[PDB]
Design a protein around this ligand. Structure first.
Ligand SMILES: CCN1C(=O)c2ccccc2Sc2cc(NC(=O)Cc3ccc(F)cc3)ccc21
Length: 61
């Protein structure tokens, strides 16, 4: 749980840093990360650690 959480968040951060990912809508990114088993908590953390505007309009909670 703990180790898999750390790894998910870290993978999400590198994901958000990908130049091809960055130019896509926030919605795409959230939905993909959710399909990757991240919690909304972890999604929010990833955006923070990646220094990217946490997408405020959060539909999928
Ligand atoms: C091929 C480039 N790319 C996308 O275009 C893209 C853009 C928005 C949403 C999903 C995708 S699929 C995709 C995935 C990835 N990376 C992974 O699938 C690896 C990964 C990322 C986050 C995780 F939580 C687990 C594995 C990189 C670029 C990329």
């Amino acid at each position: 749980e703990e180790s898999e959480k750390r790894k998910r968040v870290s993978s999400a951060v590198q994901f958000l840093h990908d130049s091809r990912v960055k130019i896509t809508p926030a919605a795409n990114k959230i939905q993909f990360l959710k399909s990757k088993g991240l919690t909304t908590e972890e999604v929010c953390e990833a955006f923070e650690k990646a220094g990217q505007t946490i997408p405020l309009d959060e539909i999928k909670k």
